[PDB]
Design a protein around this ligand. Sequence first.
Ligand SMILES: O=P(O)(O)OCCCc1c[nH]c2ccccc12
Length: 239
Amino acid sequence: MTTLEAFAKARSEGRAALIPYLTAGFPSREGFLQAVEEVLPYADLLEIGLPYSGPVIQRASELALRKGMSVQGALELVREVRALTEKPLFLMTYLNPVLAWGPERFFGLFKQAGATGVILPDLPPDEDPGLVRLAQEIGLETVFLLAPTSTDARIATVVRHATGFVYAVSEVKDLVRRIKARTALPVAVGFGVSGKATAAQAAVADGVVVGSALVRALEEGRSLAPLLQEIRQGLQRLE
Ligand SMILES: O=P(O)(O)OCCCc1c[nH]c2ccccc12
């Protein structure tokens, strides 16, 4: 289903959507695919990170690159994941590799590989609307980030360019409230959720990203379901 439908389904079920984040090729190519199999049952949508040169996420990118991850490698993995699910798949990437390959080619390749959209953490959309438009015209939803320091004007500016959803990073209820005042777009948040309690604090958002917690689980060689189940139980809105 579409990104909006994935978020809507979660909301209707009275819960914040669970969005696993997995670094492409971490801890290995096979390990990554196995991880995808384990998180999909819990995922409303999935984020796949393109490793490029937070401490935990940094460790994962570092190991992935040391093992040979590349844009071509990430492309094949996106195809592999698309073969396993019809759920929304978002590629998170810094601008550097996009510029190296050329925006039109980079975005075109990932859209063709099966990506639903891209998350561009280091691109203020208002600074290059043309680049944003290009990705959108190619068929990719474009997610941009907002920090707690964002003024009303900054929030308004970013939500004007975002599609799919808006990503708020680091209290959570306050930031979510302020963003919803300027948009009907789903709002996902990421602040190191690691269990039921921290997930409950984030339950107010339309979606909650889980990245660092999964890196740790993978490093420790633990099954992922127990962790995701605790988080899912915390994402469920109660009386
Ligand atoms: O919030 P955590 O610890 O679950 O990480 C979620 C991973 C999303 C993520 C990966 N790399 C980033 C760079 C900037 C902002 C967010 C990210």
